[PDB]
Amino acid sequence: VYAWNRKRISNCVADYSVLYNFAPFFAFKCYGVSPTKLNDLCFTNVYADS
Amino acid sequence: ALGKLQDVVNHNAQALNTLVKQLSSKFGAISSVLNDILSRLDKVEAEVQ
Amino acid sequence: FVIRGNEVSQIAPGQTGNIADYNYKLPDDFTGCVIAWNSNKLDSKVGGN
Amino acid sequence: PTYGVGHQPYRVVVLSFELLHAPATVCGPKKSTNLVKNKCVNFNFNGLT
Secondary structure, three states: OOOOOEEEEOOEEOOOOOHHHOOOOOOOOOOOOOHHHHHHOEEOEEEEEO | OOHHHHHHHHHHHHHHHHHHHHHHOOOOOOOOOHHHHHHHOOHHHHHHO | OOOOHHHHHHOOOOOOOHHHHHHOOOOOOOOOOOOOOOOOOOOOOOOOO | OOOOHHHOOOOOOEEEEEOOOOOOOEEOOOOOOOOOOOOOOOOOEOOEO
16 A cells, blocks of 8 residues: 555546456445446546555 | 716626626536536436535 | 346436346336345355356 | 454555546547537537537
């Protein structure tokens, strides 16, 4: 956690409906946006901090 | 010369301009644009905003 | 019915997804109660259910 | 493995969405139609509806 990895996502089409097939989580916690609407939006960049 | 008539016109115009500019206020919502709230949130979450 | 964990959040008014669109849709004016419980001991087989 | 649910490890991934004035680079799967001008249409430019 102190050296958390960060990855930058750009120049791609992001389908957020396959994120359920990668990790056995129960639900998103989305602030400022709703999890079901993510596929209808364009973002300038995405950052995945793990 | 005609200060009062121009003052009346100015007061009415200023009231209308203020009414228009009030549309850019968030009022505690995430955004002041109705379309952005509708597009970025589900119905249950967008109803509050 | 039976779903998996990810989709339990979709059994609610105003939701969208595979389940809420093509399988089981609830009205936006829903008045009721949803009860979901894990059934891994019953609905899961070693080779797959 | 014998620790309680509060003391067990949890893997966390945080997705931060940079939505600036720059041209969009990350988009959802959405087919784009032809551009229609001089007609009343429902337009959707990069999620701006």
